[PDB]
Amino acid sequence: MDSYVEVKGVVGHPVTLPCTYSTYRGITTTCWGRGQCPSSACQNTLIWTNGHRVTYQKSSRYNLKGHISEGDVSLTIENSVESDSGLYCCRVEIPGWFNDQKVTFSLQVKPELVPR
Numbered sequence: 185m186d187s188y189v190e191v192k193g194v195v196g197h198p199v200t201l202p203c204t205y206s207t208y209r210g211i212t213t214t215c216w217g218r219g220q221c222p223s224s225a226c227q228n229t230l231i232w233t234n235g236h237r238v239t240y241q242k243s244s245r246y247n248l249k250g251h252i253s254e255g256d257v258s259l260t261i262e263n264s265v266e267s268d269s270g271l272y273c274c275r276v277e278i279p280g281w282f283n284d285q286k287v288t289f290s291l292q293v294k295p296e297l298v299p300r
Contacts, residue, residue: 188271188288194296199264201289203274207255211235213277214257216246221273221286230272233257264293 193199205212214233217226232240236253245263250256257276261268269292276285 188290191289191291193264193291193293195265195293196263196296198260198262199268199291199293201259201272201274201291203257203259203287204255205257205276205278205285209279211253215275216259217273217275218270219273220271221275221288226273226275231259266293268293
């Protein structure tokens, strides 16, 4: 099953990429990247967490507004544009060798109103 999460946002409003993981084994790091999830960490990194808070954000338009320490690492791109459409990668570094939780998103931001 080679498949990704489809996400749809409308220009001018914030679009969210839902990404979560269980902390049943304790807190952990996460990176966000533009482009598909590859092998080792994220490519075109947008975000990095230390486990409790964001420690790296490529731009202020990228924010994790959920309870990060609870397991909610969802990415929120403020004021989306057609420009944001593309693949996104959410990687959760879980225990084990070459074993990260990888989720690729396919985002589409279209205008909410196309004229008359």
